[PDB]
Design a protein around this ligand. Structure first.
Ligand SMILES: [Mg+2]
Ligand SMILES: [Mg+2]
Length: 221
RNA sequence: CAUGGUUGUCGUCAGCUCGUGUCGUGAGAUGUUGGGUUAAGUCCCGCAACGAGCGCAACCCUUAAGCUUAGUUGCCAUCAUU
């Protein structure tokens, strides 16, 4: 990536001065109109480092889980994870998705069980109320766990868009020793993320650019 | 007011809990709280919770409309007759 590309995307913006995490002082560049500006040189350096890490893990054969439940990253994370053939979470992170995998896996298998029952002709025999409630359950399961249906083990890396909102994912990943690549905005905590990426998380263009670059890294790996 | 069994009552009020997870030094907590909705912990949304069980609901009985079987001691429509 290039500084001109980042500036065109809008990566430079940050949050107001009223809300801010002083642990990212090194990344803050300047102030403008009661908002902070990120250092794009350090941004590109960290983006290159994250690219290298993601490429190396992909080459080693690990799996990456994308988390973008933020409204400005749902579709971007969805599309980039689909492009890279990886997993994603863009609706809600269920408390215990990784630490309580012993039950989340059963919830995952419920999807395949419902599909098997539907394809085995149990659809019409069951009462109308039963089939409609099963449809509702299947829709909920796809909405929440749709992106990790084929995730049969713990991921080897977690790409998170906005850790401040994705507190749960950060906590579970840190507990389970899963490396994290984060789009850490100004008002976020960099110490939690293993591979920080100073960037504006409120900009659809910026988040899409960064997640696409990471997906390209994974594809190359 | 030593008891079994049986019963009334709040009240058919909507509660009572558990496994895994997570948070707590710990007893514990969460789930089960919040916004709505429902007869209902009923359901949805949200949410470090994810699910499950007993309660709730449903399965049982009866009533309200059809169809198949059966037509006596039930019914009377043609038909004769009382
Ligand atoms: Mg219930
Ligand atoms: Mg009942």
């Amino acid at each position: 990536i290039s500084m001109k590309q980042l500036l065109e995307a809008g990566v430079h913006f940050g949050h107001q001065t009223r809300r801010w995490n002083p642990k990212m002082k090194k990344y803050i560049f300047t102030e403008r109109n009661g908002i902070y500006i990120i250092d794009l040189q350090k941004t590109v350096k960290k983006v290159d480092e994250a690219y290298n890490f993601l490429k190396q893990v992909s080459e080693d054969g690990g799996q990456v889980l994308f988390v973008g439940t933020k409204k400005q990253a749902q579709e971007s994370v969805k599309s980039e994870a689909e492009r890279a053939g990886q997993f994603y979470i863009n609706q809600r992170w269920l408390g215990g998705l990784l630490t309580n995998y012993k039950t989340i896996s059963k919830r995952i298998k419920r999807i395949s069980e419902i599909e098997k029952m539907e394809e085995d002709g149990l659809f019409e025999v069951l009462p109308k109320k039963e089939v409609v409630e099963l449809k509702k359950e299947y829709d909920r399961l796809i909405k929440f766990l749709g992106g990790i249906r084929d995730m049969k083990s713990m991921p080897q890396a977690l790409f998170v868009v906005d850790p401040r909102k994705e507190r749960n994912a950060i906590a579970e990943a840190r507990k389970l020793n899963i490396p994290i690549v984060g789009i850490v905005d100004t008002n976020c905590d960099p110490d939690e993320i293993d591979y920080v990426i100073p960037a504006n998380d409120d900009a659809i263009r910026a988040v899409k650019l960064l997640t696409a670059k990471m997906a390209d890294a994974i594809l190359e790996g």
